[PDB]
Amino acid sequence: KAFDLVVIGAGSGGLEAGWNAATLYGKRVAVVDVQTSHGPPFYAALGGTCVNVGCVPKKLMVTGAQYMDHLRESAGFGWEFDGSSVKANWKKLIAAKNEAVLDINKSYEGMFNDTEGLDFFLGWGSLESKNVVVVRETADPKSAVKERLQADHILLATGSWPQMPAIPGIEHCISSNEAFYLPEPPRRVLTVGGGFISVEFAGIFNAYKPPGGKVTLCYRNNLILRGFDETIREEVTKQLTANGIEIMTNENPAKVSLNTDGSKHVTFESGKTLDVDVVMMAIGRIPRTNDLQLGNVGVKLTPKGGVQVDEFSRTNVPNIYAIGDITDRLMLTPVAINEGAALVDTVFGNKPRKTDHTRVASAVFSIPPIGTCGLIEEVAAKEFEKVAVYMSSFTPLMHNISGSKYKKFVAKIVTNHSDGTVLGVHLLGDGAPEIIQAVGVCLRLNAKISDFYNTIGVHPTSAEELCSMRTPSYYYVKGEKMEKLPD
Amino acid sequence: AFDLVVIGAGSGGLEAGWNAATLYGKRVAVVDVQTSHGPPFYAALGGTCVNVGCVPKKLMVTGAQYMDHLRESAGFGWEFDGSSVKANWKKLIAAKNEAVLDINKSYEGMFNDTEGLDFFLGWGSLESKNVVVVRETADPKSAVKERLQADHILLATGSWPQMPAIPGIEHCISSNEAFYLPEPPRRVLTVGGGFISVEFAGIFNAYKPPGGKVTLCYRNNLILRGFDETIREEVTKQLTANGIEIMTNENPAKVSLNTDGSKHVTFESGKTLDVDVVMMAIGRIPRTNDLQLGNVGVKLTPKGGVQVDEFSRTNVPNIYAIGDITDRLMLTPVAINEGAALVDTVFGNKPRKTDHTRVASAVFSIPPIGTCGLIEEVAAKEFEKVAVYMSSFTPLMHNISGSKYKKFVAKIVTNHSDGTVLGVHLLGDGAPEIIQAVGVCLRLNAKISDFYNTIGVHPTSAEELCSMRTPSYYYVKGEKMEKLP
Ligand SMILES: Cc1cc2nc3c(=O)[nH]c(=O)nc-3n(C[C@H](O)[C@H](O)[C@H](O)COP(=O)(O)OP(=O)(O)OC[C@H]3O[C@@H](n4cnc5c(N)ncnc54)[C@H](O)[C@@H]3O)c2cc1C
Ligand SMILES: Cc1cc2nc3c(=O)[nH]c(=O)nc-3n(C[C@H](O)[C@H](O)[C@H](O)COP(=O)(O)OP(=O)(O)OC[C@H]3O[C@@H](n4cnc5c(N)ncnc54)[C@H](O)[C@@H]3O)c2cc1C
Ligand SMILES: FC(F)(F)CNCC#Cc1nc(-c2ccc3c(ccn3CCC3CCNCC3)c2)sc1C1(N2CCCC2)CCCCC1
Ligand SMILES: FC(F)(F)CNCC#Cc1nc(-c2ccc3c(ccn3CCC3CCNCC3)c2)sc1C1(N2CCCC2)CCCCC1
Hints:
2 copies of one chain form a homodimer.
Chain A: E1 2-8, H1 12-23, E2 29-33, H2 48-53, H3 55-73, E3 79-80, E4 87-88, H4 90-114, E5 118-122, E6 124-129, E7 132-136, E8 145-156, E9 160-162, H5 176-179, E10 188-192, H6 196-208, E11 214-219, H7 230-242, E12 246-249, E13 253-258, E14 264-268, E15 273-276, E16 278-281, E17 285-287, E18 320-322, H8 333-348, E19 361-364, E20 370-374, H9 377-383, E21 386-394, H10 397-402, E22 409-416, E23 421-428, H11 432-444, H12 449-453, E24 474-477, E25 480-482
Parallel strand pairs in A: 1-2, 1-8, 2-5, 8-18, 10-11, 10-16, 11-12
Antiparallel strand pairs in A: 6-7, 7-8, 9-17, 13-14, 14-15, 19-20, 20-23, 21-22, 21-24, 22-23, 24-25
Helix pairs in contact in A: 1-8, 3-4, 3-6
One ligand M9Y binds next to helix 1 and helix 4 of chain A.
């Protein structure tokens, strides 16, 4: 079996590369993955982490969680019903999520069956030589060989995996993988970590918890969501707290033990203790390099765990490439897709293309959600002499009527004040993920603040706030925050 | 005397008045017929948008969307006593009224606390080229309250619902009265295919009592003329899917009262229909009749609008007109923009004119619409080679929500000679929020490549705009075809 391209990992980046190479350039492509559908024992499968245990199921479950707010908020608009009859059925949510993910799994299987020159191989891929991918029954190099795929080009696209801390009792904890299949919703749950996964699941568990429940989120440092706009970091903290979620900053689990009833007794480094039914570790994700036998061929890793690549996704070994989370840069599905498409254009279409990793728009599906693109102000302050910050914060009108007055919308714009170029936009509130997409197009066009405030607004929307800010709220000159420019 | 007298304390009038008083310290007078919302005049301090337009409409559509939320929650495991569910229209209106009144009071405070900015209650009209007379009523013979001497006069009285001349028209309401119905109508007929008719059809559909039915009729074949045709057809389907009856090629010919107070509607086709409310939403016309424009010779357009040049100047020197009274784009942000540009031009020697192209707008139907720029059939007449990029899909949540019919539609129209985006048209939840930043993109003359080379935000409906790289069909010399010749 001799192929133009062998892809290890049928995920976001791998599938884009395979589909493009086969359909746009008529190449013979083989793609390897460990399962054809979502779930245990391997969780990720055909379609990748995003489809199976990532963006897709997460979005469906956050959507379900939002109905706790919708039901309560409907009363302010005249909707009446027996509030004591409201119950949330977790099994129905999981079952419905499983059907939707499975429909995607089945669709991708049909893609392979019907696309000439695009073949799927079930098993574990690893590097035997520079031009041979071996597929084995299990991740263990001692397992039986299923196929040896001769490859002119090899693409490593195995994604990432939850990082689990080595504390006593870690075996009593779960990761996001298992959270997607919990048989019942935890009455008490501890989500460990300050990143988007911990925050998003905290909102899910908070909505579906049985009566007398409580969600606690802990984070080793002082403020959650490191890397996001600081104003938004503080606001989501308040709006999470306002919805019943306890946030434990400057705390970190030291050990976990079992109570007689099966619940978990958590002890933190500070000495505090907490009894919960589930402990979900979401402290990070690390590149999935352990099963590929990279040493057989000499593929180098970076000082971090990621496969080292240049801007064209080339490793140090000729004709072996790597994209997506395994490179440990921006762990986002659309980035992996773009890298895979650019790689195929470069290798097979003599159209050199490289992914732009700046000005990438992204979102956090907390409740309310975050939408962001570009630099935060403290980063821009170290790269530009004069930086201006335009800021607007307000409780939308519907939320004064709804009774959720804590739901303040935040809109921030960071600019290079020398010429007004927009460096970053940061949004908190309903619709922020949908708003920020086209803002990404604006930033690619090097839009200036005047391009925004001279655009006529759409009324009434939250987005029009971005076109209503023409005077900076404060500045950073040579890195120093100040309300007004010197002179 | 006054540097500026503004007739109409609405979107454009208040922007013009506020800017002139605070940015240039000019002495400004503003006239309006009411200080707070509601009958008999409905519009008041704050304009149509605040009192009987964008703001209350948005609140009431938000309330209407909960009918879908309550139903769709079941697909995600939520249950509750469905038989205990009631949509309390009176609570909605009461909540809406207090929100609008709070805005009325806010503008009331603005006038009291801003020097050089004064408000006069009454009906304004043109006595001469430098005199605005304020009377007690719209009747030109009613008692005079004030005579405002003005170096500059701004006409900003907005528009008014159009009503057809059919027997029994008096028994029909407009959008004005719809905001104050004491009870939600069990059976309602909304007349017209425009955005007001569609938006209120969804409001009435959500709050109607048991056994209710919303019917929308339009005199031609397809509602929402002027919007993208793919969206026009898909909106029709999704309105039908939610229980709204859409009567195309039908037009009321007469209305009479039944013995129970309901209305008996006879159509031109001979069909009949009994409803509790008939809402006329066939158009909006410039509100010029009460101004006595003949006293000074302000010329009107053949369609009834106050004729203005690019800087909002009438044919009479030092008399200007902005907003819906000009019969251009009847949008609040446009009126605001025209008002600010006028003041900058007149009182700041910084000539500014409003750009009326590539303006983003929205329809808060269920599902909503977001649009900016040209539709393809207009572009086809204006450009030799036009490409249309089209994508339809079911958002993830609607695979399990129980509303499979809620397709999201994304359309991009470009000048295929250079790929310049000429229009973007969206249908589905989030479209109003998505299209705002698209307006910034069109200002920057974004090309289709600028969209599909931008990395998407996943999972969102908006990322579909960055996923269309190949045209679905073209227009060449106005001729539709799948492939180029
Ligand atoms: C809970 C969660 C939520 C997320 N939400 C979002 C979001 O909202 N937006 C967003 O942009 N990103 C999100 N991400 C990130 C996104 O899922 C990843 O960045 C993206 O899936 C990376 O794709 P990839 O091609 O690098 O690898 P993946 O998509 O992870 O695909 C890797 C595939 O390789 C397979 N594989 C692994 N080892 C082998 C082997 N030896 N042989 C054969 N196959 C193998 C796996 O089964 C897997 O299917 C989320 C991630 C998580 C965990
Ligand atoms: C139901 C509905 C929904 C709408 N929704 C939207 C939307 O979502 N988005 C959007 O952009 N636009 C919307 N519009 C349009 C928007 O309301 C108008 O385009 C905007 O208000 C125009 O403002 P203006 O300054 O032209 O006049 P207006 O804001 O209408 O103000 C005119 C004012 O002048 C006063 N007046 C009139 N005659 C006299 C007189 N003789 N003397 C003194 N005062 C007088 C009136 O009382 C009124 O307050 C909607 C309109 C309606 C009817
Ligand atoms: F939520 C998700 F967004 F994740 C859902 N998945 C998105 C997708 C997809 C997709 N499905 C394809 C698909 C799916 C099924 C298919 C075929 C070809 C044949 N079949 C099955 C046959 C049936 C019946 C005949 N009509 C076509 C479908 C293609 S190709 C494809 C694209 N991607 C490439 C790889 C990643 C996704 C192709 C390029 C444009 C964007 C989407
Ligand atoms: F539809 C909306 F809901 F959006 C309407 N509200 C929008 C607004 C406003 C606004 N309010 C003002 C306002 C409102 C109240 C004010 C003052 C100055 C003094 N006051 C009184 C404040 C007192 C304080 C005590 N409590 C009573 C009110 C100013 S000035 C003003 C702005 N425009 C002015 C005219 C049109 C809008 C100013 C320029 C930026 C846009 C908004």
